[PDB]
Write a protein that binds this ligand. Structure first.
Ligand code: TYD
Ligand code: TYD
Lengths: 133, 130
């Protein structure tokens, strides 16, 4: 796989008989400062999300339940990645096009974001994404 | 009670699902320095009760349910968390006991500070004093 700005984070759970606990801290497990946490639930494999990019926004994606595929695209290379467990995090860094699909029904995705929500930061035209690479 | 509030989180719902977002000093009254989550839970194995002096937290039941018994020194309250569009803000100086997790429930915690092993106040009388 040749995509530069992403990384699989095989996170460390602490397990005991009460359950499993995973923790992520700014500039530690997450290579940025958390400004925003959001989560998506009530998902459906017939209803993918839209492809778009961001410029400066970084994220870490954790499948809290169920599964999905993320197609990542750096302008050059693309890679499909299945998220299907809550102890794996997908770092998506700067200048990445991505598209999330095949959510198992009712799957839940947790996202840690480096910056606040801004609809203007979504790049929906692929050619515009290329140009700014 | 005291330093604690049920947050009705606003969700965006469309045919792809529902999204809820929480942002530093907006939905959450602090800078989120840490996020953790607990899963693989079991109604037989409650968490130990304890307090924190300065840590603030927002809890969100991502799946399933649990009971949080809050104690401010004077009073106590049970809160059943059971839906993902509700958060529980737990402010400073609060004793809490989490219990009664439905099997495999999952709880998301947003925290105002980095994890500190010796910031747990695990003795109630000791809590009362300070
Ligand atoms: C990521 C995010 C999305 N949203 C909104 C924008 C959308 O209506 C909805 C779903 O987000 P998203 O699927 O990211 O964008 P779009 O639907 O425009 O492709 O949630 C927020 O309100 N806050 C956020 O932090
Ligand atoms: C909350 C938290 C706990 N942990 C660890 C410490 C504990 O061994 C385990 C469970 O924590 P927790 O239940 O808060 O403490 P205790 O087990 O002492 O009641 O997870 C972290 O590593 N980081 C964290 O942010």
């Amino acid at each position: 796989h040749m995509i530069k700005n992403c990384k699989i984070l095989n996170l460390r759970a602490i397990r005991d008989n009460r359950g499993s606990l995973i923790a992520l801290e700014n500039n530690k497990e997450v290579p940025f400062e958390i400004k925003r946490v959001y989560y998506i639930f009530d998902t459906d494999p017939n209803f993918p999300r839209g492809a778009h990019a961001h410029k400066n926004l970084e994220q870490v994606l954790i499948m809290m339940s169920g599964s999905c595929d993320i197609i990542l695209n750096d302008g050059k290379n693309y890679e499909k990645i299945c998220l299907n467990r809550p102890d794996i995090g997908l770092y998506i860094g700067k200048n990445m096009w991505r598209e999330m699909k095949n959510f198992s029904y009712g799957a839940k995705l947790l996202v840690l974001a480096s910056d606040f929500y801004d609809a203007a930061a979504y790049i929906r035209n692929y050619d515009e994404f290329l140009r700014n690479i």
